[PDB]
From a paper:
Lastly, we sought to identify a Ras mutant that would stabilize the protein in the “open” conformation trapped by our miniproteins. Upon inspection of the Ras-miniprotein structures, we hypothesized that the open state might be stabilized by destabilizing the intact β-sheet of the “closed” state via insertion of a proline into β-strand 2, thereby mimicking the strand displacement that occurs upon miniprotein binding. We subsequently found that insertion of a proline in place of Asp-38 afforded a Ras mutant that could be solubly expressed but appeared to exist exclusively in the open state. Whereas KRas(G12V) exhibits a roughly 2:1 ratio of state 1:state 2, KRas(G12V,D38P) has no apparent state 2 population, and whereas KRas(G12V) can bind both the 225 peptides and Raf RBD, KRas(G12V,D38P) can only bind the 225 peptides. As the 225 miniproteins engage the open conformation of Ras, such a mutant would be expected to increase the rate of Ras-miniprotein binding by reducing the conformational rearrangement necessary for association. The increased association rate of the D38P mutant seems unlikely to result from differences in the bound state as the crystal structure of KRas(G12V,D38P) bound to 225-11 shows little difference in contacts or conformation compared with KRas(G12V). In summary, these data indicate that the D38P mutant stabilizes Ras in the open conformation that is observed in our Ras-miniprotein crystal structures.
The Ras proteins are master regulators of cell proliferation and survival that transduce growth stimuli emanating from cell-surface receptors to cytoplasmic kinases responsible for orchestrating a comprehensive cell division program. Ras proteins are cytosolic, membrane-bound GTPases that bind guanine nucleotides and are regulated by their nucleotide state: guanosine triphosphate (GTP)–bound Ras adopts a conformation that binds Ras effector proteins with high affinity, leading to their activation and downstream signaling, whereas guanosine diphosphate (GDP)–bound Ras adopts a conformation that cannot bind effectors and thus is inactive. High-resolution crystal structures demonstrate that the miniproteins bind Ras as a dimer and interact via a distinct binding mode that captures the Ras effector domain in an open conformational state, which can be stabilized by insertion of a proline at Asp-38 in Ras.
Residue numbers in the entry:
A (entry chain B): 3 to 32
B (entry chain C): 2 to 32
C (entry chain A): 2 to 34, 37 to 166
Amino acid sequence: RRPRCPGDDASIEDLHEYWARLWNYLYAVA
Amino acid sequence: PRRPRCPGDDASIEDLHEYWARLWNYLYAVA
Amino acid sequence: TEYKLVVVGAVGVGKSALTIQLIQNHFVDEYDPEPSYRKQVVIDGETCLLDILDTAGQEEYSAMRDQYMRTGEGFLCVFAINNTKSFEDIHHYREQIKRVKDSEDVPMVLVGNKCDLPSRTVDTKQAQDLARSYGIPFIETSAKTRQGVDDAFYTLVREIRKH
Ligand SMILES: Nc1nc2c(ncn2[C@@H]2O[C@H](COP(=O)(O)OP(=O)(O)NP(=O)(O)O)[C@@H](O)[C@H]2O)c(=O)[nH]1
Ligand SMILES: [Ca+2]
Ligand SMILES: [Ca+2]
Ligand SMILES: [Ca+2]
Ligand SMILES: [Ca+2]
Ligand SMILES: [Mg+2]
C-alpha cells in the first residue's frame, strides 16, 4: 500500500502527487 | 531549500513521516 | 493555489467512494496495477490544486494522525442518510477538528452521502438544522450517481477562500 518513491528525476508536480499519496498512507497505517 | 530524499525499503513509518514533513516543507518553500 | 481538504466520517459512510468519484470518475471497482489523491480544477474562475486526505473510518488516538489532520485547511464532515449513528457522530467530528486546529473558525461542509438509496433514516431537515446551527453549508451527495460530489468539494474550497 506504501507509495513507490517518486524518482530522483521527479518534477515538482510529481512530488506533489507522491506527497498526497503518502499523506493518506501514513494516516491509514497509524 | 534542499530536496529531501525518499527513504528505502528499510524505512520505518517514522522515517516516512519525517520525509512527509520535510517534503511538505520543501514543496512549500519552492512555491 | 494549493488546498488541503480532509474527508472525515464514521465507518462506511462513503469517504473513499466520494474521493474516488471526484478524482477518477467511477463508482464500480477497477483493477489497474497507483491511486491519485490530487486534482486540478477551476472553481469560480480561478484554478485550484486539491489534495485530499481520505481518512480511515476506524478511529484511535494518534499524534501522527493529529498532525495529518492539522495539515488540512478545510474539512468535509460526511454521514450516510441511511445511518443515524453516523449522523449523530458529526458533533464529535466537529469537536475533533476544533481540537486539532485549536480554533472555532475552521472551514467545514456537512455532507449527507448515499442519497441514491431506496430508504432513508436521516431526514434532510435534521441535517439542514444541524449545519445551520454550526453555520456551515450542507450538501446531499451520492458517490454512486455522482450527484452533488463536485458541489461538495467545490463549496468547501469556497469556504476556505472566505476564511
Ligand atoms: N448506494 C451507495 N453506496 C455507496 C455510496 N458511497 C459509498 N457506498 C458504498 O458503501 C460502502 C462504503 O464505502 P466506502 O467508500 O468504503 O466508505 P468509507 O467511509 O471509506 N469506509 P471506511 O470508514 O471503512 O474507510 C461501499 O460498499 C460503497 O460501495 C453512495 O453514494 N451510494
Ligand atoms: Ca493503530
Ligand atoms: Ca477514470
Ligand atoms: Ca495509536
Ligand atoms: Ca438513539
Ligand atoms: Mg475508506
